[PDB]
Amino acid sequence: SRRRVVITGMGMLSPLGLDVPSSWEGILAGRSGIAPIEHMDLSAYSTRFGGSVKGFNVEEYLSAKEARKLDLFIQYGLAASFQAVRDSGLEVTDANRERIGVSMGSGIGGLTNIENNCRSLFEQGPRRISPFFVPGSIINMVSGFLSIHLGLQGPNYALTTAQTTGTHSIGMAARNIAYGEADVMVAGGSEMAACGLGLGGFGAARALSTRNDEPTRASRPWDRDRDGFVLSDGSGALVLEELEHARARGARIYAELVGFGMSGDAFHMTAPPEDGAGAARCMKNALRDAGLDPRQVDYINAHGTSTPAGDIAEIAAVKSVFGEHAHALSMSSTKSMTGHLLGAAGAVEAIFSVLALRDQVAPPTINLDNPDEGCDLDLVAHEAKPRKIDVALSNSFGFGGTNGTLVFRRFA
C-alpha cells in the first residue's frame, strides 16, 4: 500500500545564504537576512526593506542567454532544484527518468516579469512584450524547465496555495511517491514578489511591517510590538524518494516525511479564526497521518509570520492540539530571521525542520523581546536551543484559509 518517503537532497536560496549550509548557519547564528531594498526606488512605499537573495549568480547554474528570459522566481526555483538533485546523488537514467517528477510551486510567480511587460505594453505598446513573457513568468515553468534540463519524465506540476505553497508542494509530491505515481519527486517552492506590485499590493493591505528604521528587528513573531510580516525572496527544493528506492541506491537519508495534513479554515480570505481551528484540524490530520501521539512532537517550525492575528491564532491551535505537551515541545519562527518567503516559506522551513532533526537543535525566534499575552510556550527566544528532536512539524497557513502541516522524523 502506501510506501514510505524520505528526504535525500535539499537546495535553497534565502536571505541568509545561496545554499542550505550557508542558510542553516545563519539560522543557528540568529542572523537577520533583512535589509533596505537596493534593486529599486521605494521612497513612495510605506515598507522599504525585506529579505533579498544577496549576490545570486544565475550563471552558476544557467547560461546568461537562458536566464535573461526567466523571471527571478524561476531562476531561484531552478537553482534550489539543481542544488537538491546534486545533493541527492541521484543519477537520472532511461531506467528511472519516467519515475522522477517535479512539483515546484509559487504563491505569486513572475510578478516582476509581469510588471516589466506591463510597463512595455502601457509605455510603448504590445509590440514590445517579450516573446518569452508567458513561459518566463507562469508558475508551472520551474517544474517545466527543471524537467527539460534534467530529463525528468515523471509527474510534472505546480501548486499555488499562496503562503502554504511550499508545504503543500512537498506534501502532495510525497503522496505521489507514497501511492506509486513516482519513485522520486523534486518538490518545494520559489518566490520573488519584491517589485512595485508586490510591495505595493501587500502595503495596500497594511500586511507588512513598516519598521523601516530597524529592518532586522521588523520580523518579531509573538512579540507585543509586531506590526505585520517582512516580504522575502528565495526558494527551497527537496528530493523526496521512496524509502526502498533510497536504500537500494545507498542514498544518504536526512529524515523521513511521515505526516501530511491539509485543511481549509473556511472562515476568511485574509484573517485566521482567533482559535486557529483550521491550523488545529490540519495538525491533527498530519499527526494521525503520521501514526503519532501528539506528545512525540519535539519541535514545531511555526508559520509565525509576525502578524498580530496570525501569531496568536497559531499559539491557540498548538495549545488546542498538544494541551499540556504544548509546554514541553519547542516552537520557533525562522521568519524572525528570513522574513516571509510566501510560496517558498514552507519549502525553506521544511528544510529547516529536517536540519533541526539532523543537528538536534531548535532554531531561535529572534526579536522575541516581549512575548505577547498567552505566548507562554517555549518559543526559543533569541538563541538556538540544542534539545532532543525525534519528530518535527512545519506549519504553513495561506490566503483563503488554506493550511498545510508536514511531519518529519529522524530515520535509522
Ligand X SMILES: CC(C)CNC(=O)c1cc[nH]n1
Q: Please report, as residue ranges, which positions from 187 to 226 form the binding site for its own copies (by CB under 8 A).
A: 196-207
Q: Least CB distance from residue 205 to ligand X, whole Å? A: 10
DSSP 276-306: -HHHHHHHHHHHHHTT--GGG--EEE----S
Closest approach of its own copies to the CB of residue 271, in Å? 10
Q: Work out how close the CB of 350 gets to its own copies at its nearest, in angstroms, rounded to a whole number.
A: 16
- Measured from the CB atom, the residue of 11 and 401 that comes closer to its own copies is 401
**# of chain residues touching its own copies (CB under 8 A):** 88
226: cell is 509586531
Give the residue among 368, 371, 34 at the shortest CA–CA distance from 212: 34
**Subset of residues 391 to 410 that bind its own copies, contact rule: CB under 8 A:** 398-403
What is the total residue count of the chain?
412
Q: Which is nearer to its own copies, 70 or 238 (CB)?
A: 70
Beta strands 330-332 and 299-301, pairing class? parallel
Report, in Å, the least distance between residue 241 CB and ligand X.
27
Nearest residue to ligand X by CB is: 310
Among 14, 23, 112, 143, binds its own copies (CB under 8 A): 143
One-letter amino acid at 173 equals A
Q: How far is the CB of 301 from ligand X (least distance, A)?
A: 14
Which residues neighbour 125 within 8 Å (Cβ) at sequence distance 6 or greater?
A: none
CB of 32 to ligand X, least distance (A): 22
Interface with its own copies in residues 79-98 (CB under 8 A): 97-98
Choose between 13 and 286: whose C-beta lies nearer to its own copies: 286
Nearest CA among 100, 101, 198 for reference residue 159: 101
Residue whose CB is less far from its own copies, 20 or 173: 173
Using an 8 Å Cβ cutoff, are 78 and 62 in contact?
yes
Sign of CA dihedral 127, 133, 135, 139: negative
Among 87, 265, 349, 372, binds its own copies (CB under 8 A): 265
CB atoms within 10 A of CB 19: 18
Of residues 49 and 254, the one with the C-beta less far from its own copies: 49
* Residues of the shown chain interacting with ligand X in the complex, contacts defined by CB under 6 A: 265, 270-272, 276, 278-279, 303, 310, 313-314, 317, 397-399, 401
Q: Which is nearer to its own copies, 205 or 328 (CB)?
A: 205
281 binds its own copies (CB under 8 A): yes
Provide DSSP, 217-284. Answer: HH--TTBTT--SB-BB-EEEEEEEEEHHHHHHHTPPP-EEEEEEEEEE--S-SS---TT-HHHHHHHH
Instruction: Quote the cell numbers at residue 352.
Output: 529547516
Smaller CB separation from ligand X, 90 or 282: 282
* Contact with its own copies (CB under 8 A) among 150, 253, 309, 384: 150
Q: Closest CB to its own copies among 119 and 295? A: 119
Only segment of 14-22, 55-63, 168-176, 349-357 that touches its own copies (CB under 8 A): 168-176
Longest CA pairwise span in the chain (Å): 64
Q: Is residue 353 a contact partner of residue 301, using CB atoms and an 8 Å limit?
A: yes
**Cβ-contact 378, 329 below 8 angstroms:** yes
Q: Is 227 in the site for its own copies (CB under 8 A)?
A: no
Q: What does 319 bind: its own copies, ligand X, none (CB cut-off 5 to 8 Å by kind)?
A: none
| Shortest CB 265 distance to ligand X, Å | 6
3 state SS of 381: strand
